[model samples]
Target: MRKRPLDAETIRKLIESGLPEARVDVQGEDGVHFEATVVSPAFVGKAPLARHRMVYATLGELMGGAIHALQLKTLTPDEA
Candidate 1:
C-alpha cells in the first residue's frame, strides 16, 4: 500500500479518457489494486474476455507499466 489511497476519483479519471459511461471502484488501501465495471458501445459484439481486454487496452502504459493490478469486471449496457 502506498501513501495515497486508490480511491474512485483516480480510477474515474483514468477510465474517462477512453471509456464512455464508465464506473470504477478501487478497494485496496494502496493505489495499485482496483475493481472496475465499465459500459461502452465499443463492447458491442465483443466476447466477455475480449471486452475486458479492450478495457485494459485503454489503459495504455498503465496496463503493464504502473498499474500493478486491476480486477476488471466488464459489462455492456445490454447485459444489465
Candidate 2:
C-alpha cells in the first residue's frame, strides 16, 4: 500500500507527541522534504547523533518512505 506524503505539521505533531516536554518547529512545503528544530529536556544528556535518533524514532517507518528528507537540528532547552 502507498502512503500519503507527510507534511511538516504531521511531523511536528509526531515529534511533540512522542517526546514529552518538547518544543518543535518544522518547515516544509513539498510534503516530502522537511526541516525541523526540536528543543527538549529529553535531549539534555544525549549525544548529537542520539538526539537525532530520538527524533527519527518518532516517525518510525515514515522516515524513509513518505518523508523523504529531513534537515534536523536537535537541541536541549539550554542550547535553544
Candidate 3:
C-alpha cells in the first residue's frame, strides 16, 4: 500500500519541535520528496552523519516511509 505524503510545513514543524533551537527550511514540489536545511547549536560537536541522524530521528517512522527522499543539510547555528 502507498503512504500519504507529508507536507513541507509539517516536516519543518517536526524538525523545529524536535530541535527546539533549530532554524529549519524545507522545500519540495512533491510532498514525499524534500530538501531541508537545518541550523542549530545542537549540532555544534556533531559530525555530518550525526547531524543528519538528529534530524532523521525527529521524523521517526516517517523517515523511511512517508518521507521517501530527503536531501538534508545540517549546520551549526554559527555556520548558518
Candidate 4:
C-alpha cells in the first residue's frame, strides 16, 4: 500500500524479463490497476490458473507491492 506507482511499461518489461519467450501487452489507466495479455509456448498444456500463476511468477512480489492486481489473458501461440 505504501509502494510507489509502477507504470504499465515497467510491468510489461518485468513480465518479459521473467517470461523471456512470452509476447506481452499491459495496460493501465491508473498505474496500479492493470490488464495484460501474454502468449507463450510455456502456456501450452497449462491450465488458466496455472498460466496466471506462471505470469505472476514474473513479477517477483510486485503484485503485492507496486502492482495491486492484474487482469490477465494468457494464451499459447496456437490459441493466439
> Global lDDT of each model?
0.55, 0.67, 0.67, 0.65
> What is candidate 4's lDDT per residue for 1-80, written digit by digit as tens?
66565555676687678766778876664436567677887767765666677666554336445456657766787776
How many clashes (backbone atoms < 3 Å, residues ≥3 apart in a chain or on different chains) does model 1 have?
Answer: 0
Q: Flag the better candidate by TM-score, 2 or 4.
A: 2
**Per-residue alpha-carbon lDDT of model 3 for 1-80, expressed as tens digits?**
35455455676787777776779877763436657777888667765666667676664426446455668766788886
Counting clashing residue pairs in each candidate, in order, gives 0, 0, 0, 0
Point out where model 1 deviates above 4 Å: 1-7, 29-31, 47-54, 57-70
TM-score leaderboard ranking: 3, 2, 4, 1
Measured by TM-score, how close is model 1 to the native structure? Answer: 0.44
Give me the runs in candidate 3 sitting further than 4 Å from their true place.
1-6, 29-32, 59-69
For candidate 4, the 10 contiguous residues with the lowest summed lDDT are 57-66
Give TM per candidate: 0.44, 0.57, 0.59, 0.56
Q: Candidate 3, after superposition: displacement of residue 15 in Å?
A: 2.3
Worst 10 residues of 1 by lDDT: 23-32
Q: Give the per-residue lDDT of model 2 (tens digit) for 1-80.
A: 46565565676787778777778887754435667677887667765666777676664425445365667766777776
RMSD of each: 5.2, 5.7, 5.8, 5.9
Model 1: lDDT to the true structure: 0.55
Can you write out model 1's per-residue Cα lDDT over 9-73, one digit (the tens) per residue? 45556777656665544443333555556666666776566666656555432643436566756
